[PDB]
Amino acid sequence: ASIRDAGVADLPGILAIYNDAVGNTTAIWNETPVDLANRQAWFDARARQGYPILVASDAAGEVLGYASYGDWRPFEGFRGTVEHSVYVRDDQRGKGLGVQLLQALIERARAQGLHVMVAAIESGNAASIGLHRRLGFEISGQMPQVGQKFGRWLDLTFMQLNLDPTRSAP
Amino acid sequence: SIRDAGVADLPGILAIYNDAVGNTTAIWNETPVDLANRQAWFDARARQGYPILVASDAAGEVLGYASYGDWRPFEGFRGTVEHSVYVRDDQRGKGLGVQLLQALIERARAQGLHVMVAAIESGNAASIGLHRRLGFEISGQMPQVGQKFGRWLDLTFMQLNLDPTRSAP
């Protein structure tokens, strides 16, 4: 599998993955699917801020997964901290894609001079939690019942990675 | 006296807002705002049904205020709101924070909400203590996710389940 920046041609493939995570998982906390327009607007807002959108792609340019990050919280104080997300196409799980994607994302965030990457994972998702811990992420939050989906309460686990521990001041 | 905020209260609220922005770590911005910014905010909340409460004396002065809004922008977190309380410098030690928080909790509760989140700069022990004595629990401790005054700031998340008897949403 090849990792590269997303182009507008990749949006249809990204839409398929996104809408699946929406309807069958707790990787996204929305229950409503979106259209291509919605993902096009999202793609542009990202390019505007200088934030990357990476995709795991086929020789046949098929989208197997994608990753990206944006602001964590809407205040000037958190500009050094971004929140990312990685999604892999259902049939592609268990092949190491999430690792390749998350590793590439970390390198871009680091090249951008960013300071902290935050992951917001549903607590029961052991697969995702283990993937991150192996990449240096540490648990820093356990928030019970802050979310809901499929008719039940969901717990949130915050994991974070410091990209430059030697940097004493902003 | 604790009561809802009216447009005649915006000036006093902005005075408090801007003092917190310039002298403290209670707000995570370094730039002050005008009265128009606060008028828009006033309107945004009323539209969402979110309260804005003020502590006022006999003269009608704004001694402090509290409010809450969304915590995160996904439908999945609509039972959870992030709130914040601000008390005027010269009115601390008068138990006004306690009063504002209590009234806001009864508000969030009567409104069908499930959880109230507070984001507090980890070094602010007085604020953390005020929340503990009211049922809040530490649910997050994040190092260097913020910055202000030229230094890294740690954030502490504290939450309060408003109705644990409800096993499903």
UniProtKB/Swiss-Prot annotation, chain B:
Domain N-acetyltransferase, chain residue ranges per copy: 1-163
Catalyzed chemical reaction(s): L-methionine sulfoximine + acetyl-CoA = N-acetyl-L-methionine sulfoximine + CoA + H(+); L-methionine sulfone + acetyl-CoA = N-acetyl-L-methionine sulfone + CoA + H(+)
Keywords: Acyltransferase, Transferase
Catalytic activity, EC: 2.3.1.-
Binding site for acetyl-CoA: V85, Y86, V87, G93, K94, G95, L96, G97, V98, N124
InterPro entries linked to this entry: Acyl_CoA_acyltransferase (IPR016181), GNAT_dom (IPR000182)
Enzyme class, UniProt record, top EC level: transferase
Residues binding substrate, per UniProt: R72, P73, F74, E82, H83, S84
GO molecular function: acyltransferase activity, transferring groups other than amino-acyl groups
Function per UniProt: Plays a role in the resistance against the toxic effects of L-methionine sulfoximine (MSX), a rare amino acid, which inhibits glutamine synthetase (GlnA). Catalyzes the acetylation of L-methionine sulfoximine (MSX).
Subunit field text: Homodimer.
Protein name: L-methionine sulfoximine/L-methionine sulfone acetyltransferase
Species the sequence originates in: Pseudomonas aeruginosa (strain ATCC 15692 / DSM 22644 / CIP 104116 / JCM 14847 / LMG 12228 / 1C / PRS 101 / PAO1)
